[PDB]
Design a protein around this ligand. Structure first.
Ligand SMILES: CO/N=C(\C(=O)N[C@@H]1C(=O)N2C(C(=O)O)=C(COC(C)=O)CS[C@H]12)c1csc(N)n1
Length: 263
């Protein structure tokens, strides 16, 4: 059985030609609205939130960890390194790496976060530690974005990622200082204007992390503070049947617009 919300999302999905996954959590009453909420989707860059959060968790017991400089070698650079390329034969702190990964989608920066955690398995272990039983990170950048049909690697479900993003940004999966830091990073994201943000009232404060990959995979996860009501968490995942499909950030904006109706 479906609600009008789910029917609108299904119609959007059909018109888009792809596969859409949505999870909304309204913290006013802890209700969820889901569309393909328990299907796996390739996370691509939305996985950078889990890696940054894992390092924040480490820093709760290692207080200067975020300010630890990490060497950036020429050999570290991968396919998209807008911030890290400014620091080749130099350093970035774990805070700077987190900001670059989250706010500029820097893939080299993500690889340093992954390395700090001991590899993709370290990121997954953090996910399990905060109660996310679904998330899995298997690969480093750039191959974690291959988004191959049927491939379980580097996937999660909309429901799981929404629950986790809520716990990280509004709940207490992290310490208070670290939660605030993650919120600050997400709020300052530079890559999200055309995605969930484009489908929501401009007066709402939004923190988000985008992701993109092959199969026209177009993703965004967001924490949302509407004017005068409890915050929301929204995950919108989208992927398409053919490997070189075009990005569709408009589909994410449309999904957000549908979800926002009545709120
Ligand atoms: C093998 O890797 N292939 C990638 C890829 O690097 N995806 C990563 C990902 O997510 N990224 C983000 C991200 O984390 O959102 C953005 C966003 O950056 C900007 C400026 O908005 C830039 S691409 C990078 C890819 C991307 S699209 C396609 N067919 N493939």
């Amino acid at each position: 059985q479906t609600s009008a919300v789910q029917q609108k999302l299904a119609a959007l999905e059909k018109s888009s030609g792809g596969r859409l996954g949505v999870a909304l959590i309204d913290t006013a009453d802890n209700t969820q609205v889901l569309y393909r909420g328990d299907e796996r989707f390739p996370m691509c860059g939305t996985s950078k939130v889990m890696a940054a959060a894992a390092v924040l968790k480490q820093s709760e017991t290692q207080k200067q960890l975020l300010n630890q400089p990490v060497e950036i070698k020429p050999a570290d650079l991968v396919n998209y390194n807008p911030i890290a390329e400014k620091h080749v034969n130099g350093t970035m702190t774990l805070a700077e790496l987190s900001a670059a990964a989250l706010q500029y989608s820097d893939n080299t920066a993500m690889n340093k976060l992954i390395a700090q955690l001991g590899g993709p398995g370290g990121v997954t272990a953090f996910a399990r530690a905060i109660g996310d039983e679904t998330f899995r990170l298997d690969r480093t950048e750039p191959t974690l974005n291959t988004a191959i049909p049927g491939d379980p690697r580097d996937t999660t479900t909309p429901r799981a990622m929404a629950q986790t993003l809520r716990q990280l940004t509004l709940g207490h999966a992290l310490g208070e200082t670290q939660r605030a830091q993650l919120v600050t990073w997400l709020k300052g994201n530079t890559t999200g204007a055309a995605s969930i943000r484009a489908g929501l009232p401009t007066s709402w404060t939004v923190g988000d992390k985008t992701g993109a990959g092959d199969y026209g995979t177009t993703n965004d996860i967001a924490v949302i503070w509407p004017q005068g009501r409890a915050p929301l968490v929204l995950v919108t995942y989208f992927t398409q049947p053919q490997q070189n499909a075009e990005s569709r950030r408009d589909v994410l904006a449309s999904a957000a617009r549908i979800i926002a109706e009545g709120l």
